[PDB]
Ligand binder design. Sequence first.
Ligand code: HEM
Length: 153
Amino acid sequence: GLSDGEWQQVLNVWGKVEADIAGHGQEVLIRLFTGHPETLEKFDKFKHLKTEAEMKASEDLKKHGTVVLTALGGILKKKGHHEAELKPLAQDHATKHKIPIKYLEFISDAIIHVLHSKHPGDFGADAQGAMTKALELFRNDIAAKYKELGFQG
Ligand code: HEM
């Protein structure tokens, strides 16, 4: 898992995100959808959005961005002792939404990208290292539940 020092870095960084969760949430989803258009098809809600400009102008998209980072923040705050919160999330993303673990990889990368874009020079080597590991742990725990359910993707 992560050391206490590492968890401290993750929650310090999360402080940056909480100052503007909708702004961070929206840019994450944009990065995802533009870098991997197939992911947009999973949302009936945003499949109409072709252009990035349209994406930028969607208040609905911003709303979902908020929903997503609120859920993620709640899990990160548990520092690994997140079974309770994570299982239900894993079960609906596999059975209901039908999201392959590769798309969780993609969003993980989108988060790191956004953190550097919005905090250039403010998101250092130790911080990036800790956040990367935290997102890997998150993905790994999801992968365990996906395996139980036999969801391939
Ligand atoms: C940081 C990773 C993610 C988090 C924390 C997250 C969280 C959530 C939450 C809290 C909801 C609403 C309740 C539910 O239906 O389960 C949701 C809905 C959904 N998620 Fe995710 N999600 C993540 C990644 C993804 C990815 C990568 C995709 C697809 C590329 C995706 C696809 C969807 C869809 C299609 C819905 C239904 C939304 C609607 O139309 O109302 N999720 N997600």
